[model samples]
Target: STGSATTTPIDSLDDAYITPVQIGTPAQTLNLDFDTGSSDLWVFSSETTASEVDGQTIYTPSKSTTAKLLSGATWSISYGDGSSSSGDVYTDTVSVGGLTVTGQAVESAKKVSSSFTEDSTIDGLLGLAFSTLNTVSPTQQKTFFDNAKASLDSPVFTADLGYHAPGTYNFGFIDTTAYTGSITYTAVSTKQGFWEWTSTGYAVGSGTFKSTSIDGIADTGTTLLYLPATVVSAYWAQVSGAKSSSSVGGYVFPCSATLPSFTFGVGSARIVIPGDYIDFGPISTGSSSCFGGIQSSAGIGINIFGDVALKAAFVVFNGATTPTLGFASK
Candidate 1:
C-alpha cells in the first residue's frame, strides 16, 4: 500500500477546517492538519484529559487495531505559547492517501495545554517540510516523509495551497506525468536544524530587495517571511513613500490600492508572492500596516521564508542525501 494524502480547504463546515483525501483506497475518513511551524503528528484518546479537549477527537487505539505504540514515551513542548500536551509514543498502521505504513510515530496528547487544547479538533498535523526539524532527540524516530519517501514511486511531494478551491496539500511520489524530467532543485542547508533556503537573493515589491545573496533561510517552522532593510526600503519605494508607522514594527504603503507583487531569486529560480497579501490590515495605529507577510527582522538573522512561502508550492526535502533542501511546484 503506497500513496499520500492531499487536502483541499473548503469553508469550515461541522468544525472541519480541511478535507482529507487519501489518494486510493476504499478511501477512508481521517482528520489531517498541515502545520508548517513544527514537525510532528498528534492525536488524543479516551485517556486524554476531558478538560483539555475542548474540540479534539479521541482516537480509539483499540478500535483502529492498526495503531501501534512506538516507544511508549510521548513528549509535548510548545514554544512559550503556554500550550502543551503529553502522550505515549506509538507506531501505528497509518495511511496517507495511497501510502500505508505500519510503524508511523504519532502522539496522543492527553493533558494538553490551552494553546492546543482550544476548540481545534485538529487531530494531527503533517509537518510537510524538511527533516532537520524533526524533534527526535536520539534521532531514531522517523518523519512522515522519511517513511513515505522510500515507497513513493517518484519520491516527490508538493503542497499545492489553493486560494479558492479546497486548500490542497498534496504529497506523494510526485507524478511528473506533465513534465519531461526533474526541475532544477535547490540544495538544502541545515542552519541550527531549521531547513534554511540558501537564497541567492530577493526582489522586494518590484525588485528592490538586494541585500545579501545566499544569506537567507527558507524556514518552514516559522510564520511570516523576513527581508533585509535596503530591500525593504526599495520595496516601499513602489508604495509612494511607504514608511513604518508609529504602532507597527513593519513598513507599508496603504495609499496604494494595487500593491506591486514581490519576487525572490532563489538560485536560478524566482518565486513570486501573491499581490493581495499587501494589505494584511492595519497592524499599526495610523496608516502604517504590517502589510503582507513582510515584517521587521532587524535582529532576526537568516531571512525566514516561512509557511507563507512554503504554502505556495510543494517542497522536496532530501535529507537521506548529505546536504538537504529541494523544492518543486505542483
Candidate 2:
C-alpha cells in the first residue's frame, strides 16, 4: 500500500523536522528525525543510563512481545558535529505512515553524547539513507525504508522541507500537489552511502553563473548549507559588513545588509535560495550581527545541501537501479 507521513518542524524549524513512528508489537510511538545522511533507526531506550536520558521518550522493547534481541549486535555512530551514540540491537516491528517492517533493526542507545542528551524531545533518528551505511557490527542492519521497500508501491520517497513551516516526507508514492514546476532528474553516486551528486555551478543573486562544479551530499540532518571555504568566502564578501568571525564561528554580517540570493545548479536546473533565507536570523536575539546560513565545509569532507539549500527546492530520493535525484521548484 502507498503511504505518506506528516513531518513536523522543531525549534522554530531551525534544527530539524521529525516524524511519528511506531515501534514494537504493542506500538510505542516516538518522534524520529528522518535523516537522509545516515543509516540506522536508533532510539533512547531502557538501556540508557537515567542521568544520560532527559525528557526524551524511551522505547521499551520488553513491553513488546514481538521484540527479539540480535545477540552480539552493537552499533556506534559519530556524527560530523561530534555527537556520538552506541547501543545494543533488537529486531522489532517498525511502522511509519501505513507501511510496516516486521523485523526492523532498532538500536537502543545505552550511551549518548551531550548533543543528543540535551535535545530531549528527539527520541531517535530514522535513517532514510541507503542500508549500506547501517552501523550494526557482526551483521549490518537494513534501514526501515529498505526493509519496507519490497512491499511498497514504489521504491521512492520525497522530502518537502519548509522554511519556518511544516513539511512532509512521503513514502512509496509522490504527491503532485507538494511541488510546482517540472522535476529535473540527476544521477546520484551512492558509493559513499549518500545521495551525492555534482552541482554544475552556482551564482550569487543576478551574478553570472560560474562553472565551478561542486560535489556534495543532500543532507537533511544538517541545518545549514555547507560549501567549500573558498565558495563561502566569495559569497560573504559580496555582502556589505560581512566578515569571518572566530567568536561567532563562520561568517557574520550586519542584519541590515541586503543579502543576495544563493543559487545552486544541477545540470540545467537552477535552485535559488532567497536572500532572506541566507540570513539565518540574528547571531543572538537583539544582536545586530547575524550568522550566515551558508557556512564553510572545511572540516566536513563533503559539502552539505542542508535544510538551507534543500528547502529551496522539492527533492526526490529515488531508490531505483540508477538511483537518480529529482528536483523541482517549491
Candidate 3:
C-alpha cells in the first residue's frame, strides 16, 4: 500500500509545469502538464491527423498490448486560454511518480488547436481535478488520481511550484522539507469541479488589507492571477499608464513601472505575490509594454489563483474527508 510518489518538473515555464508520465504496457514516457484545473488524461497520439501535428512526440496506443478502446466513447475540452482538443478513448496503464493505475481512461487526441500544436514539447495533459470533471462522452471517464486514490496511504498531492525554476509534485504523502512555516488549511468547494475557495479580501502594495469576499479556484493550468475587474482596477490605479487594452487583451503597463506586491487572504493566512512577478513578461518579444499577471476574471466567470499566486506558496491538495487545501510558504 505504498502509493507515494514524487515528480520533478521536466520544465517550468512562467506559465505551466511539465512532468513525465508513463502510459501503456511497456511504459511509453511523455511529458504532460499536470493540471489541477482540468480532469481528463489526454495525449497527442497516432490518431491525430498528420497535418495537425507539428513536432510533438505521439502516443502510439497500438504498440501497447494492454491498450483497449472504450467503444463509442470520445472527449472534447476547451480551456480558458482557448486551447482545445478532441479525441477517442482507450483504457491503459498509467503511472506517475511511484503510483500506478491500471485500465485508466487515456484520451487519444485526434484534433488539437494551435495552442497545443505549437507547444511541441508538451505531449499531453494529466488532469488532477476531480473525476466529476472528466469530459469523456457516452461514458465519462475516471482520472489517474481517482483510480489510484484507494491505494494511496493518504490520498494527497502537493504543488511545490517554483518561479523560473523546477519544482516537485508530491503524491500520497507530504514532504515537510519542501515548504516552510505552518500549513494554513482552508476548506475547498468541489461543486465546480475545481479547488474553489474563498478569499476574505486583498490589498495592493503594502496598503491595508480590505474586507471583501471573493470566490476563486486554485488552478495550476492557468498562467495568471485573475481577480474581479474592480479588484484589478484598484491594483493598476497605483501604476502610471496602466490601462485595459482590447487589442492586447487584459491590462498592459509600462515595462519600466515598479509595481506593488499583491496579497490575497485565505482564512488568516496572507499569500503575497511579489511585484516583479506581476509583470508577466513583455506583451510581445521586444515589445516595450508588458501584460499584468493579475487581470479581470469577468469573462471566465471565476477568479483564478494561477502560477502567479501558487508559486508564492506550497499548496497541498488534500483528498481527505470534505477536501481541504493547505498552504505554506516555500
Candidate 4:
C-alpha cells in the first residue's frame, strides 16, 4: 500500500509545514506538523487544558468508537527550542493520506507550551523519525510509519518541502515524477533517532566546494539551516552589511543585501539553496535588518539541514534493512 499527502507552509516565512491527518473512527481531520526531528504522534485534544487551547482544532477521542485508552501510558516531549508538551496516551485509528494504521498510539496533550498555543495553524505534530525517539514512557510505541511499513509496498517515505508553496509527503513508494536527476543515496545513522548523515562538504554561492565532512540531520521540523560556525560565517561574509548580532539572536544583514546561494554535497551530488531563500525576512515589521536562514550550529551541538535545506531538494527516508537516505534535485 502507499499514501500521499500535501504539505503546506503555515505562513509566508515557511517556518513550518503542515499536513492534514485523520484520527479516530469517524475521522477528525486536523492539520499537523509533519516533523522528522522527533517521534511521537501527539495532538491537541479534549484532554488539553482549556486555558492553553488557542483557536486550533482539537481531537475528541470520545467521538470515536474505536478509541481505546492506553492505561498507565504517558508521554512528554521537549524540543531544542525549549517548547514542550505532555499528556496521556490513547490508541485509535489514525490515517494519513489514505494510509490507515489501527491501534496507533496517539498522545493527547494535557499541557502545551505557549509557543504551541500561539501557533493557530497547527493542531499538533506527527513525528516521522525513528521510534527510538518516542517519548512515551514504560512502553515505547512505534511511529505511524513504523507501524504501517509492514503493510506498505516499500519501506520508505519521501519529503518534498517547498518554499512558500505546497509540497508533498509520500509513504511506501517513491514518486519518480516528483523529482529530477538521479538520486544520490547515503547511509543514515539512526542512533539518535534522526535522519542523520554526513554531508561531503559545501560551497558559498559559486565558490569551490569544501571537502570537509559535515555531520547533520535532515530535520523538516526546524525552520533554519544550521552548520558549523566557520561555514555560516563564511557565507555571511559574502553578503554586505551582515553581522552576528546577539540582540537579534544570530546573524542578521541589511534587508537589501545581495545574498548568495549555498550548495551542499550529498556524495557526488550537490543541492543548491537559492540565496533568496536564506533571507528569512526582516527582524521586525518594517525593519531594515533581516535574519539569516543559515546560522551556526555550535550552540545546537549538531548541525541541522532544516527546512532551509530540505526545500531545495527531494529527500527520501528509506527504512530498508540497512536504512538509508536519498537526495535528488527537483
Residue 176 shift from truth in candidate 4, angstroms: 0.5
Model 4 residue runs over 4 Å out of place are: none
lDDT of 2 at 241: 93
Q: Rank by lDDT, highest first.
A: 4, 2, 3, 1
- Give the clashing pairs for model 3: none
Report lDDT per candidate: 0.55, 0.89, 0.87, 0.95
Per-model TM values vs. the true structure: 0.76, 0.97, 0.95, 0.99
List candidate 3 segments past 4 Å from native. Answer: 1-13
Query: Which candidate would rank higher by TM-score, 1 or 2?
Result: 2
Per-residue C-alpha lDDT of model 4 across residues 92-182, encoded as one tens digit per residue: 9999998999999999999999999999999999999999999999999999999999999999999999989999999999999999988
Index of the highest-TM-score prediction: 4
User: Over the stretch 48-126, how does candidate 1's per-residue lDDT look in tens digits?
Assistant: 8788776655565655555555554655656422455666665676666656655777665666766556646455555
* Model 2 TM: 0.97
Q: After superposition, how far is residue 236 of candidate 2 from its true place, in Å?
A: 0.9
Least lDDT summed over 10 consecutive residues: which range in candidate 4? Answer: 273-282
TM-score of 3: 0.95
Q: Which candidate number would show the highest lDDT if scored against the true structure?
A: 4
